[PDB]
Amino acid sequence: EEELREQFRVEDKDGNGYISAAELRIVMTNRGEPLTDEEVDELHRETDIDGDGQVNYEEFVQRMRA
């Protein structure tokens, strides 16, 4: 539980409770940069279950457990 909470806080740079596309790019750049910016956009869309353009904590956890 706190494991994912801590990791989410690391990815959420401005502390607004959401991971943005740019925040997800930073995450991917720091783990080998396997994707292009366009592809990170697609990753962000698939993770954004409720479609508000943001990845919240519940959406992060569903991804992390898959």
Return the residue of 5, 10, 17, 33 that touches a copy of itself, per CB under 8 A.
Answer: 17
15 in contact with a copy of itself (CB under 8 A): yes
Return the residue of 4, 7, 41, 54 that touches Ca ion, per CB under 5 A.
Answer: 54
List of long-range contacts for 38-42, beta carbons under 8 Å, 24+ apart:
none
Q: Tell me if 41 sits within 8 A of 22, measured CB to CB.
A: no
Using a 10 angstrom Cβ sphere, with 0-12 exposed, 13-18 middle and 19 or more buried, the burial of residue 37 is exposed
Contacts with a copy of itself by CB under 8 A: the residue count is 24
Return the residue of 4, 21, 27, 28 that touches a copy of itself, per CB under 8 A.
Answer: 21
